[PDB]
Design a protein around this nucleic acid. Structure first.
Ligand SMILES: [Mg+2]
Ligand SMILES: [Mg+2]
Ligand SMILES: [Mg+2]
Ligand SMILES: [Mg+2]
Ligand SMILES: [Mg+2]
Ligand SMILES: [Mg+2]
Ligand SMILES: [Mg+2]
Ligand SMILES: [Mg+2]
Ligand SMILES: [Mg+2]
Ligand SMILES: [Mg+2]
Ligand SMILES: [Mg+2]
Ligand SMILES: [Mg+2]
Ligand SMILES: [Mg+2]
Ligand SMILES: [Mg+2]
Ligand SMILES: [Mg+2]
Ligand SMILES: [Mg+2]
Ligand SMILES: [Mg+2]
Ligand SMILES: [Mg+2]
Ligand SMILES: [Mg+2]
Ligand SMILES: [Mg+2]
Ligand SMILES: [Mg+2]
Ligand SMILES: [Mg+2]
Ligand SMILES: [Zn+2]
Ligand SMILES: [Zn+2]
Lengths: 97, 201, 91, 97, 127, 25, 214
RNA sequence: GGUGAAAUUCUUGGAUUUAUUGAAGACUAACUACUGCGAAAGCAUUUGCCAAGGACGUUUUCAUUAAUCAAGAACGAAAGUUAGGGGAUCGAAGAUGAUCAGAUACCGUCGUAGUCUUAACCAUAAACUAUGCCGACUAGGGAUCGGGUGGUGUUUUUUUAAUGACCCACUCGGCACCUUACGAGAAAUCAAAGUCUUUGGGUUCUGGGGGGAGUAUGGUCGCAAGGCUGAAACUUAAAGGAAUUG
């Protein structure tokens, strides 16, 4: 599944969590794909979607709240957005995404 | 003094450069910052206000107008609503069912707001003690507490007097009764513990 | 240490008003003082004040709900039966 | 003592079967114990067959029958239909005829 | 050839019904039943009465429009005996023997996907 | 008498003696 | 002393195009008096007639057809399609013990935006050497056949306007296409559609109604 | 209308019947079987989803981790209880019509609670196979269920296959049935109820003449109804089981 894919990234790849550090990555073009939680407010969503297209970065709308995304990355806290810095053994960068 | 919370909803004035604010009753689920749409052509989403003609049957709306424009008559108390049960496009009536169970038929231009009214279940909690009822009616009107007419002397009430405390005659008073007679069960078409299923046919 | 065997929050009324009334209150009273999950910001910071009104500690959103609980079963199904009807007017 | 290995009828390895209602007296009775007959009979009968094809369009046309299941509570089954009674060993005979 | 109608014989116990109607069903004609040609309240379904009911029934059929009629027999059904009553075989017989033609009869007994618990209760009508 | 009606007999009989005894607690 | 038969009218029912005969039968209404006349009062009935009386031969002896009446003009009330049922005797004789029954259905639209729900029924047959007495399926058989029949039933409908679907069902084009996709799963004797009911139709469109008349 | 037959009841309100159409709640007919699955209660429309499971397969892994179980605990038909919703149907109650010497009933009418669902309780059924679990051995037969192996088997033809369904032989594990009885039993019968005076594989539970009595009492659980634990005095020569003749 998509989570099983995100699980692969987490255990073999480079990434960051949180809104401030995903813009650090988006400005430097380091991000290959950002994942956006369902309940993330639209203003932030539209803001990332602008940064992302200026970075020419793909954007996956996670069909789930920020609580679930935190579980998805395997953390006990919640995350609103993820940034894939390097895709590890996973294929998320070139798949249905 | 009201059951249901109110919703302050501000609009632009289409004719003057100014903000004009209305006072709606909060339909359950509406929130601060929500966008409310109000009009004939308007999406069928909780919180919006639509003419009864423009919603399918089964729609559940509150604060509905009796005649179009009276700015809200039916289904206002916390927890109530009306359901549309059909349409007659020629004459553009819309048959609805009111919280009482009554099934009135009103104009399809009449306006209602999608959803039910916030604050439901308020009447499931025991007041538990006099003071709760005191502070209740304190902010409504001087209707509480209620001395029984059967505890007063006859000057005071039809039920007053007697060496024992009793009504003395049938407490069912006719519609044609006159002021000062009507006390008890006015125009009662029946009486006694309602056993068996209610729910109008 | 367990302080009371069944009254819980309802122990403030003590012996008064009759066990059954106290029982009914304890339910809704537990319903109404509790912290709820916020739809918008994903934290459990929704609390009540003024029955009907439910606002979130941070993110400062205020939702109209049921008198002693955020979502009431009625408004819940009404949500879905409106969701159903709405979809009949696009597809 | 016990007078039937089936104990009344046909349930081994099941636990609980659902009751059917008797077509004669409406007595509920489990379906496995619910003595059953198919009612195959024409719409027409002994003598009405000739008068039928006599004043009728459609040369002989089909003559189709009516079908339905019948379910009897043992009592009613014993009162009229296929029951009567058998000797000690004749009982075990499950041959229909 | 002929001008068609529908027979629709409801022949349950304790009474038998016949009545021809237009092939659309909406407009009907010439009913009379088995409790109309005898007065004993127990013979309301017996064939001797269903005959005399079919006699007067086919009369007005030719006396107004019909030269032929399809038949749709029916028992009580629903949750009831589901089997045809006594005065069904005689009624169809005593109207095909009236001169009218018979075409493509079926059975429209109501048969459910069982529900609506049968009356008489679990121990059944016991007498 | 039928077993279960005798079972019901002593059920009431117990309930009443339970009742009479509590008039004394 | 009235005898409303001295007062009733009479009307002859005409059938749609894709059959053998269009002459159906006769009816009775009333005099077309002003203020509740005979025209827009009823006219909106159905007539259940066996299509073997509508097609002649008896290879269609079962399969009732409902004809709803839409319009009228000069003692002539044309009718259109309203549904198809099965004769009770046929079904009650298809359902025999010692075999598996399989039913399936799906709701679907058409180009002419008619909505309906077609049905399907099929039974398992024995192989023509088979020893065992029952020959049941395997409940994954039954699931696959349902999904396939459902897959097949959706392609035929929305294939242009129940009118052409009327043409499709009569010669059992669907039944043998079922038999095609089925035979790779289980033998399955007796496949038919057996039933279809209409529930919604678009606006009248007096034009397209007369597109099957003349 | 309803019945053995009747009556209470419904009928200018067009009753019953018919026709088109709609609403609500319930149930899943026929297919349904000495057929399937679950620890038992139990479980039968479609489809999507969610975790679960036995049997088989196995030249995979661990290597005694197990058998059975006071206490303790999970589930537990129906009815019943609390709070919502639901309340079509059938319908403890109650009211009636009849029958009867009577008829608080059986039959007929009306119909409250109930029946359905959510949240909580209750923990009982002839909850039955009236028959503990794990292991071994002891006997013949043909059916069927699931898995698997064998095929110069049949049928589907396309061009021969591949498949799918079917046939035949085998082998595990199912639900059962048939015949025997070496054997067992008081018998009815029983491949276990057999391999017991030639009396010992492991282990759990209960019973000790009939009433009294599942009563009294205490404890404990339960909102209630009631559940679990549970005596004695006294009384009594029988009660009981299976079979045989009447
Ligand atoms: Mg005052
Ligand atoms: Mg007072
Ligand atoms: Mg007062
Ligand atoms: Mg005084
Ligand atoms: Mg006075
Ligand atoms: Mg007075
Ligand atoms: Mg007085
Ligand atoms: Mg008083
Ligand atoms: Mg006996
Ligand atoms: Mg049984
Ligand atoms: Mg059982
Ligand atoms: Mg009897
Ligand atoms: Mg006292
Ligand atoms: Mg079914
Ligand atoms: Mg009810
Ligand atoms: Mg009574
Ligand atoms: Mg009496
Ligand atoms: Mg009584
Ligand atoms: Mg017990
Ligand atoms: Mg049993
Ligand atoms: Mg053997
Ligand atoms: Mg022997
Ligand atoms: Zn928040
Ligand atoms: Zn019976």
């Amino acid at each position: 599944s998509i989570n099983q894919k995100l699980a692969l990234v987490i255990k073999s790849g480079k990434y960051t969590l949180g809104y401030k550090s995903t813009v650090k990555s988006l400005r430097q073009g380091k991000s290959k794909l950002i994942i956006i939680a369902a309940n993330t407010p639209v203003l932030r969503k539209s803001e990332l979607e602008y940064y992302a297209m200026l970075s020419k970065t793909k954007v996956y709308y996670f069909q789930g709240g920020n609580n679930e995304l935190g579980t998805a990355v395997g953390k006990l806290f919640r995350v609103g957005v993820v940034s894939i810095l390097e895709a590890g053994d996973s294929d998320i960068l070139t798949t249905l995404a | 003094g009201r059951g249901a919370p109110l919703a302050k909803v501000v609009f632009r004035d289409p004719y003057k450069y100014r903000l004009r604010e209305e006072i709606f009753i909060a339909n359950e689920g509406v929130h601060t910052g929500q966008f409310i749409y109000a009009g004939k052509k308007a999406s069928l989403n909780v919180g919006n206000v639509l003419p009864l003609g423009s919603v399918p049957e089964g729609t559940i709306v509150s604060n509905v107008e009796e005649k179009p424009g009276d700015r809200g008559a039916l289904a206002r108390a916390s927890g109530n609503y009306v359901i549309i049960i059909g349409h007659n496009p020629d004459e553009n009536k819309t048959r609805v069912r009111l919280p009482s169970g009554a099934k009135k038929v009103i104009s399809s231009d009449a306006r209602g707001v999608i959803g039910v009214i916030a604050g439901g279940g308020r009447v499931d909690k025991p007041l538990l003690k006099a003071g709760r009822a005191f502070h209740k009616y304190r902010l409504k009107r001087n209707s509480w507490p209620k001395t029984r007419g059967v505890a007063m002397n006859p000057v005071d009430h039809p039920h007053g007097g007697g060496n024992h405390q009793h009504i003395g005659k049938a407490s069912t008073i006719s519609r044609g009764a006159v002021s000062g007679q009507k006390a008890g069960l006015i125009a009662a078409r029946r009486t006694g513990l309602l056993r068996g299923s209610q729910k109008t046919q | 240490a367990k302080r009371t065997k069944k009254v819980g929050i309802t122990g403030k009324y003590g012996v008064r008003y009759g066990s059954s009334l106290r029982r009914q209150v304890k339910k809704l009273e537990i319903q109404q003082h509790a912290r709820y999950d916020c739809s918008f910001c994903g934290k459990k910071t929704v609390k009540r004040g003024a029955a009907g009104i439910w606002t979130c500690s941070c993110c400062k959103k205020t939702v109209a709900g049921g008198a002693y609980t955020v979502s009431t079963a009625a408004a819940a199904t009404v949500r879905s039966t409106i969701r159903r009807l709405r979809e009949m007017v696009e597809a | 003592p016990k007078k039937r290995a089936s104990n009344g009828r046909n349930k081994k390895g099941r636990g609980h079967v659902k009751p059917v209602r008797c077509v004669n007296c409406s007595k509920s009775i489990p379906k496995d114990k619910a003595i059953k007959r198919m009612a195959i009979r024409n719409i027409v009968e002994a003598a009405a067959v000739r008068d039928l094809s006599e004043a009728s369009v459609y040369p002989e046309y089909a003559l189709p029958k009516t079908y339905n299941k019948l379910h009897y509570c043992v009592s009613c089954a014993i009162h009229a239909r296929i029951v009567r009674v058998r000797s000690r060993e004749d009982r075990k005979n499950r041959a229909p005829p | 050839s002929q001008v068609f109608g529908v027979a629709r014989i409801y022949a349950s116990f304790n009474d038998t019904f016949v009545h021809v109607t237009d092939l659309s069903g909406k407009e009907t004609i010439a009913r009379v039943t088995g409790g109309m040609k005898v007065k004993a309240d127990r013979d309301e379904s017996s064939p001797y009465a269903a005959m005399l009911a079919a006699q007067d029934v086919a009369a007005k059929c030719k006396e107004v429009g019909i030269t032929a009629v399809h038949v749709k027999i029916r028992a009580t059904g629903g949750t009831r005996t589901k089997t045809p009553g006594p005065g069904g075989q005689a009624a169809l017989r005593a109207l095909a023997r009236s001169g009218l033609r018979i075409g493509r009869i079926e059975d429209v007994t109501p048969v459910p996907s069982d529900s609506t618990r049968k009356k008489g209760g679990r121990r059944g009508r016991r007498l | 008498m039928r077993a279960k009606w005798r079972k019901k007999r002593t059920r009431r009989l117990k309930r009443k003696r339970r009742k009479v005894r509590a008039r004394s607690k | 002393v009235v005898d409303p038969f001295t007062r009733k009218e009479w009307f002859d029912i005409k059938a749609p195009s894709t059959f053998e005969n269009r002459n159906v039968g006769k009816t009775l209404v009333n005099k077309s008096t002003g203020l509740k006349s005979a025209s827009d009062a009823l006219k909106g009935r159905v007539v259940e007639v066996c299509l073997a009386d509508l097609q002649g031969s008896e290879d269609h002896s079962f399969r009732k057809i409902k004809l709803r009446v839409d319009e009228v003009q000069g003692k002539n009330l044309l009718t259109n399609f309203h549904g198809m049922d099965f004769t009770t005797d046929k079904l009650r004789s298809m359902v025999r013990k010692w075999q598996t029954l399989i039913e399936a259905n799906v709701t679907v639209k058409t180009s002419d935006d008619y909505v309906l729900r077609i049905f399907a029924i099929a039974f398992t047959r024995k192989q023509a050497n088979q020893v065992k007495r029952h020959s049941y399926a395997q409940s994954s058989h039954i699931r696959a056949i349902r999904k396939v029949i459902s897959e097949i039933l959706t392609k035929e409908v929305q294939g242009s306007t129940l009118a052409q679907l009327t043409s499709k069902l009569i010669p059992e084009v669907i039944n043998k296409e079922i038999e095609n996709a089925t035979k790779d799963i289980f033998p399955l004797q007796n496949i038919h559609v057996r039933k279809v009911k209409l529930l919604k139709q678009p606006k009248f469109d007096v034009g397209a109604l007369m597109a099957l008349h003349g």
